[PDB]
């Protein structure tokens, strides 16, 4: 249907997905899907498919 | 149907998904789905599919 | 149906999903679904599918 | 049906899902579903599917 | 259907997906899907297919 | 001597010398001296001289 | 001597010397001296001389 | 002597000397001295001389 | 002597000496002295001389 | 002596001496002295002489 956005934003800061580490053997980031970041952000029908992720360690 | 947003926001700061660590053997982040971050943020029908994630350690 | 949002927000700060650690063998974050973060935030029909996540350690 | 929001909020701060630790062998966070965080936040029909998560340790 | 965006944003800063590390044996970032970052950002029908990613270590 | 001020004030509003009228033949304001207005305000040795004012009507 | 000011003020508004009128034959404002207005305001030795003002009507 | 100012002010608004009128035969403003207006404002030795003003009507 | 100013101000607005009128036979503004306006403002030894002003109507 | 200014100001607006009118037979502005306007503003020894102004109407 109808989607509307009115965003009158000022002095916007945005951080999305971050990691900070020190003396760490691994850093893993996984996204099976969609990341949207922004001051003003819209997202629809992003994951029509199977969003499935594995981080398996043996 | 109809979706409307009126956002008059000022002095916005946003952080989404963060991690902080020190002397950690691992950092894992998993997203099987959709991340939206923002000052003003909309999301619909993001995960039409199976959002399933495994972080298995052996 | 009809969804409306009127947000007149000022001096907004937002943090979503964070972790802080020190001398930790692991940090795991899992999302099988959808994360929305923001000053003003809308989300609908995010998880149409099976949002199921496993963090199994052996 | 009809959903309306009128939010005139000022000096908003929001934290969602956080963890703090020191000298902890693990940190696990699991979300099988949807997280919405924000100053003003709406969410509907988020989990149409089975939101089921396991954190099993052996 | 109809998607509209009105974004009158000023003094926008955006960071998307970042990692910071020190003396870490690995940094892995995985995206099986679509990343959109921006001041103003729209995304639809991004992942029509199966967004599935594996980060398996043996 | 020594004058110190420590003012940690938040959400300050200040009005000084105001007048409001309706259908008044005159409005007179007189200051022979010094007006200081402010959130945080200091004043010393303002009127070293003769602060003398006349509003005489004949 | 020593004058110090520490002002950590936030969300400051200041009005000094104002007048409001409707259907008034005169508005007179007189300052023989010094006006200081501000969020943070200091004033010293302003009126070393004779601050004397007359608003005489005949 | 020593004058110091530490002003850490945010979201400052300042108005000094204003007048508002409607259907008024006169508006007079007089300053014989010094006006300082500002967010942060300092003033010293402004009026070393005779600050004397007359608004006489006959 | 020593004058110091530390002003860390953000989002500053300043108005000094204003007048507003409607259907007024006169507007007079007089300054015999010195006007300083600003976000951050300093003024010293402004009026070493005789600051004396007359607005006389006959 | 020593005058120092440290001004770290952001988003500064400044108006000094303004007048607004409608259907007014006169507008007079007089300055016998010195006007300084600015975001950051300093002024010293401005009026060493006699700052004296007359606005006389007959």
From Swiss-Prot, chains A, B, C, D, E, F, G, H, I, J:
PTM annotation (Phosphoserine): residues: 52
Effect of residue 15 to A: Impairs copper-binding
Residues where Cu cation binds: 15
Species in which this protein is naturally found: Homo sapiens
Entry comment on modification after translation: Phosphorylated, predominantly on serine residues. Phosphorylation by CK1 appears to occur on residues distinct from the residue phosphorylated by other kinases. Hallmark lesions of neurodegenerative synucleinopathies contain alpha-synuclein that is modified by nitration of tyrosine residues and possibly by dityrosine cross-linking to generated stable oligomers.
Reported impact of residue 4 to F: No effect on osmotic stress-induced phosphorylation
Region listing for 4 X 11 AA tandem repeats of [EGS]-K-T-K-[EQ]-[GQ]-V-X(4), in residue ranges: 1-32
Protein name in UniProt: Alpha-synuclein
Entry domain remark: The 'non A-beta component of Alzheimer disease amyloid plaque' domain (NAC domain) is involved in fibrils formation. The middle hydrophobic region forms the core of the filaments. The C-terminus may regulate aggregation and determine the diameter of the filaments.
Function of the protein: Neuronal protein that plays several roles in synaptic activity such as regulation of synaptic vesicle trafficking and subsequent neurotransmitter release. Participates as a monomer in synaptic vesicle exocytosis by enhancing vesicle priming, fusion and dilation of exocytotic fusion pores. Mechanistically, acts by increasing local Ca(2+) release from microdomains which is essential for the enhancement of ATP-induced exocytosis.
Gene this protein is translated from: SNCA
Tissue: Highly expressed in presynaptic terminals in the central nervous system. Expressed principally in brain.
Subunit and interaction comment: Soluble monomer. Homotetramer. A dynamic intracellular population of tetramers and monomers coexists normally and the tetramer plays an essential role in maintaining homeostasis. Interacts with UCHL1. Interacts with phospholipase D and histones. Interacts (via N-terminus) with synphilin-1/SNCAIP; this interaction promotes formation of SNCA inclusions in the cytoplasm. Interacts with CALM1. Interacts with STXBP1; this interaction controls SNCA self-replicating aggregation. Interacts with SNARE components VAMP2 and SNAP25; these interactions allows SNARE complex assembly and integrity.
Listed result of changing residue 18 to T: In PARK1; no effect on osmotic stress-induced phosphorylation; increases oligomerization
Location(s) in or outside the cell: Cytoplasm; Membrane; Nucleus; Synapse
Sequence repeats: from-to residues: 7-21, 22-32
Family membership: Belongs to the synuclein family.
UniProt disease link: Genetic alterations of SNCA resulting in aberrant polymerization into fibrils, are associated with several neurodegenerative diseases (synucleinopathies). SNCA fibrillar aggregates represent the major non A-beta component of Alzheimer disease amyloid plaque, and a major component of Lewy body inclusions. They are also found within Lewy body (LB)-like intraneuronal inclusions, glial inclusions and axonal spheroids in neurodegeneration with brain iron accumulation type 1.
């Amino acid at each position: 249907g109808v989607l509307y956005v009115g965003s009158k934003t000022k002095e916007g800061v945005v951080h999305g997905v971050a990691t900070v580490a020190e003396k760490t053997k691994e850093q893993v980031t996984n996204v099976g899907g969609a990341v949207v970041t922004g001051v003003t952000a819209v997202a629809q029908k992003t994951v029509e498919g199977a969003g499935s992720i594995a981080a398996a360690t043996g």
